[PDB]
Amino acid sequence: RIDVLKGEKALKASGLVPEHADAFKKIARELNTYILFRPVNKLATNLIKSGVATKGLNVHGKSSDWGPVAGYIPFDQDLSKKHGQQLAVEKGNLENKKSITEHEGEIGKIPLKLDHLRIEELKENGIILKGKKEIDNGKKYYLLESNNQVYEFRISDENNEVQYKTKEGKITVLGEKFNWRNIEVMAKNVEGVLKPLTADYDLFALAPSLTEIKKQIPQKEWDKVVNTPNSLEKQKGVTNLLIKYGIERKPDSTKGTLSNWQKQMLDRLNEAVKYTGYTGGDVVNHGTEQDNEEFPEKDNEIFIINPEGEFILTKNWEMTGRFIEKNITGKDYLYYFNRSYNKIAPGNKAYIEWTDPITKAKINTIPTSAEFIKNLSSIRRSSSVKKIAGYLSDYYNSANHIFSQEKKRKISIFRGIQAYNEIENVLKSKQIAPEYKNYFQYLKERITNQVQLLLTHQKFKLLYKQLNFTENETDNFEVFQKIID
Amino acid sequence: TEEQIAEFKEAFSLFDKDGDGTITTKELGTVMRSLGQNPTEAELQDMINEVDADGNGTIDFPEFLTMMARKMKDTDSEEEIREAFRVFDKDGNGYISAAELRHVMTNLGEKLTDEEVDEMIREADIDGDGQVNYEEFVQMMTA
Ligand SMILES: Nc1ncnc2c1ncn2[C@@H]1O[C@H](COP(=O)(O)CP(=O)(O)OP(=O)(O)O)[C@@H](O)[C@H]1O
Ligand SMILES: [Ca+2]
Ligand SMILES: [Ca+2]
Ligand SMILES: [Yb+3]
């Protein structure tokens, strides 16, 4: 049992338009595939529903979740939800600035217009209240109050334009002060007219069933593999089709990095909402969060729609991990987690943890030569026996496939103790680098657990005495053979 | 990447009884393998003649570093392979078992007998523990 939210209560916490999430129930069932979304600006839901255009990757400025511009993407990023955070606002503004120029004609900016109906919605949401009247240079204005401390807003009675200015004595995050001026919002070009943008739906992940992936493979490419006499090549061949038609992703000009089944899913999803009436265009504009390797986000709550059309919403990252583990990654579904997890993302330096089974096994398996080297390439950051990088290359020798398990275990348990030897006498020399001594005291431990394992699979230091290091050929391998009995 | 170059260059000195980072084609293959590849005698040739048309047989970093430059192109699918391994390992123990292989297989169409399955595991198995770890899965997919 895991404390997740369900149905209506979960849909409410998602930020998605109800009609839309319902339309999405279909696709989840039809294709049998889990659809996982990231939080959606709760103040953007009504805008989206009323048909406001959503935003693509060509606009990275954040949306607002407060004040008269809640839901839209303010040009001035200090009006966005990143309000008050100087570094974020600056990155935000630099982003809007690039969008306006690097995409001149496609992305622009226009004065925010709060219409009669939106004002009401903002009142119900307790975001702003229509205040007292005011006249300026022969123009009628009504103030718009907000519990905000730095700014003050008012709206024009003639054309409904909203303006803002800094407060007496108050300063901006960027250290500015200024009087009355329009609030500009990011817009996209539609038939020669600039239309305001709002948040869109961001897929956190997509987990399709393996059978659903099969349909992605040409039924005659698969056949040529299903009928391969040799097994070892048949397997590699089956795996390569999985990689090819389900795992592999590629960068797209505007949808970021995604696979091909993902592109179809994208399309079905956007079509699904159009059938329900959404008139703004696409609502899902790019690949999933799992390919956001440079600037990974980590949300507490993920909104999930399972293949049975049900609504789930996890409470915290750990819970999102349990769910995916118990119902997807361990239940015959295609899935892959962000490559940046368990690392320091380059972009934002984020360090998001995620359970990786391959590592759980690390402690009990011995490293391949490569891994041995690449760990002398990363170890040689904070700062000649090639025999070890050879033995390890010997341990994982494909030739082993013509022998019997009994045989395999024997020669491996040997090739291991071999590597556990060279490493031993290296540590017997000079602790060259204080921290290198660890890599070895460590390998030794792995090598140990690995050998010790193969042995119990049949019948360590106890046997590391009665053995040859002395002269160096197949003479040592001799005593060994007999010892294991 | 920096490490990419760091890696190659790192091993380049593990065996070079020359000291000037200018080995021979006698060990060029010895290097590409202790690093993670398995080039054929034919490949260790045509290339050691094109880029290294020098006429000495001495391989230095500038040469070696540029050669890898190309091979490490399509082969880099290592990322997908590793993600693939995770697809098979349904119980997340870090190893691919026969049972798990059946699942992945039947769900993709090709129905197999407990006989055949255990034959596949045992072929990919290298240390004879009856299961396949990522290291092995890599071999079976590259080698
Ligand atoms: N500074 C930056 N540089 C490059 N890419 C960035 C970026 N900031 C964000 N991204 C990209 O943008 C994606 C993050 O979602 P975003 O497009 O920025 C809007 P959102 O998630 O809908 O939030 P919002 O409601 O605040 O607008 C990631 O997949 C990432 O690739
Ligand atoms: Ca397993
Ligand atoms: Ca094994
Ligand atoms: Yb987005």
The answer as to whether B117 is a domain residue is yes
Contact B81 A213 (CB under 8 A): no
What method did the depositors use to determine the structure? X-ray
Q: How, if at all, do strands A53-54 and A193-198 pair?
A: parallel
* Domain end call among B74, B93, B121: B74
Q: Which CATH superfamily is domain A41-199 in?
A: Anthrax toxin, edema factor, central domain (3.90.1760.10)
CA A146 distance to own-chain centroid: 35
Amino acid identity, position A226: V
Residue of A85, A201, A202 to test ligand 1 pocket, by largest number of atoms within 8 Å of CB:
A202
My answer on whether B96 and B85 are in the same domain is yes
- Paired with A109 in beta bridges are A186
Residues with CB under 6 A from ligand 1: A 41, 57, 60, 62-63, 91, 95, 199-200, 202, 256, 292, 295
Answer yes or no: do B79 and B133 share one domain: yes
* Residue B60 sits in the same domain as residue B32: yes
For residue B57, give the CATH number of its domain. 1.10.238.10
* Shared-domain flag, residues B60 and B90: no
Known active-site residue A83: no
Q: How large is the greatest C-alpha to C-alpha distance in chain A, in angstroms?
A: 105
Tokens 């592109």, residue?
Answer: A263
Q: How far apart are CA A120 and CA A193, in angstroms?
A: 26
Q: How many residue pairs from chains A and B have C-beta atoms closer than 8 A?
A: 180
How many other CB atoms sit within 10 Å of the CB of residue A119?
19
Residue at A304: amino acid letter: I
Q: Which secondary structure element, helix H or strand E, spans residue A93, and what is its range?
A: helix A86-102
Domain encompassing residue B63: 16-74
Closest chain A CA to residue B5: A377
Is the same domain home to B48 and B104? no
Q: Same structural domain for residues B52 and B83?
A: no
Query: What does the alpha-carbon distance between residue A401 and residue A382 come to, in Å, rounded to a whole number?
Result: 40
Nearest ligand, CA A57: 1
Token pair 């097994």: residue: A231
Whether B97 has its CB under 8 Å from any CB of chain A: the answer is no
Q: How buried is A432 (Cβ within 10 angstroms: 0-12 exposed, 13-18 middle, 19+ buried)? A: exposed
- How many structural domains does chain B have? 2
Alpha helix (H) residue ranges in A396-429: 405-427
At A276, the amino acid letter reads T
> CATH for A355-485?
1.20.140.60
Is the same domain home to B68 and B79?
no
Catalytic pick among A20, A60, A83, A103: A60
CA–CA min distance A208, chain B (Å): 12
Burial of residue A12 (CB within 10 Å: 0-12, 13-18, 19+) is middle
Q: Which SS3 state, helix, strand or coil, does residue B23 take?
A: strand
> Resolution of this entry in Å?
3.0
Across A215-327, where does the E strand assignment appear?
Answer: 250-251, 257-258, 303-305, 311-313
- A59 CA distance to ligand 1 centroid (A)? 8
Contact indicator for A74, A185 with CB cutoff of 8 Å? yes
Sheet of strand A129-135, all strands in order from the earlier edge strand to the far edge: A129-135, A140-145, A151-156, A162-166, A181-182
Q: Do B133 and A454 touch (CB under 8 A)?
A: no
Domain end among B36, B55, B74 = B74
- Of B15, B56, B11, residue with least CA distance to B37: B11
Asked if residue B22 belongs to a domain, the reply is yes
Q: Look at ligand 1, atom 2, and give the residue with the nearest C-alpha.
A: A60
Residue A406 structure tokens: 């009994």
All residues of chain A having their beta carbon less than 8 Å from the beta carbon of residue B36 are 368-370, 373
Spatial contact of A322 and A332, defined as CB atoms under 8 Å apart: no
- Run of H or E residues at B58: strand B58-60
Dihedral pair phi/psi, residue A153, rounded to 5°? -125, 165
Cα(A67)–Cα(A81) distance, integer angstroms: 10
Residues B86 and B63 in one domain: no
In angstroms, what is the span from residue A19 Cα to ligand 4's centroid? 20
C-beta separation of A395 from A419 below 8 A: yes
Per residue in A262-292, is it b (16+ CB within 10 Å) or e — as a string?
A: beebbeebbebbeeeebebbbbbbbbbbbbb
**A46 alpha carbon, distance to own chain's centre:** 27
Q: Treating both helix axes as pointing N-terminal to C-terminal, what angle do B134-141 and B78-88 enclose, rounded to 10 degrees?
A: 120
Q: Is residue B8 part of a domain?
A: no
Report the distance separating Cα A100 and Cα A94, nearest Å.
10
* DSSP letters for A148-181: -SSEEEEEETTT-BEEEEEPTT---TTS-----E
Strands annotated E in A26-158: 33-37, 53-54, 107-111, 129-135, 140-145, 151-156
Any idea where the domains of chain A sit in the sequence?
1-40+200-335, 41-199, 355-485
B88 with B139, same domain: the answer is yes
* Distance, CA of A185 to CA of A195 (rounded, Å): 9
Chain B residues within an 8 Å CB radius of A360: 92-94
A322 vs A28, A299, A326, A398, B90, CA distance in Å? 20, 15, 6, 36, 14
- The tokens describing A137, both together, are 């240079």
